[PDB]
């Protein structure tokens, strides 16, 4: 039942995003786990800002 | 002195360009009306939350 950061794993990379709920969520791939789950962007911004920035930098468009 | 060497606290990114060959941000600094350019990679390290706020606003489907 623990989900996201409550699983106690290290974030590895963001592999999706959705704001359909009213808040921005990231699908987080965790280190040494096949099972990605959603986390609040607000939480990821604080706990792993460079992983967040990497997700944005790979999809820049002009 | 330019960019972060002005020693001002970053406040908001108000623009971006790649014309130097690397991504730069136009940084508006708090208590200064003179914005100027900083490397994105430097902003990533020094003010990641300001970088993220900029990107978050421009995320689009």
């Amino acid at each position: 039942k623990p989900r996201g950061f409550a699983r106690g794993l290290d974030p590895e990379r963001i592999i999706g995003a959705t704001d359909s709920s009213g808040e921005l969520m990231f699908l987080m791939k965790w280190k040494d786990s096949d099972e990605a789950d959603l986390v609040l962007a607000k939480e990821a911004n604080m706990k792993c800002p460079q992983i967040v920035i990497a997700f944005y930098e790979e999809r820049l468009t002009w | 002195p330019r960019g972060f060497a002005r020693g001002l606290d970053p406040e908001r990114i108000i623009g971006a360009t790649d014309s130097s060959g690397e991504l730069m941000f136009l940084m508006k600094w708090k208590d200064s009306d003179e914005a100027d350019l900083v490397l994105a990679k430097e902003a990533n390290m020094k003010c990641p939350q300001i970088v993220i706020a900029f990107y978050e606003e421009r995320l689009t489907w």
Binding site: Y56, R59, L60, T61 | T17, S19, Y55, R58
Partner: peptide
């Protein structure tokens, strides 16, 4: 079924 991007505009 769109892909998210960060949409920037070049200064000037």
């Amino acid at each position: 079924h769109k892909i998210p991007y960060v949409r920037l505009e070049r200064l000037k």
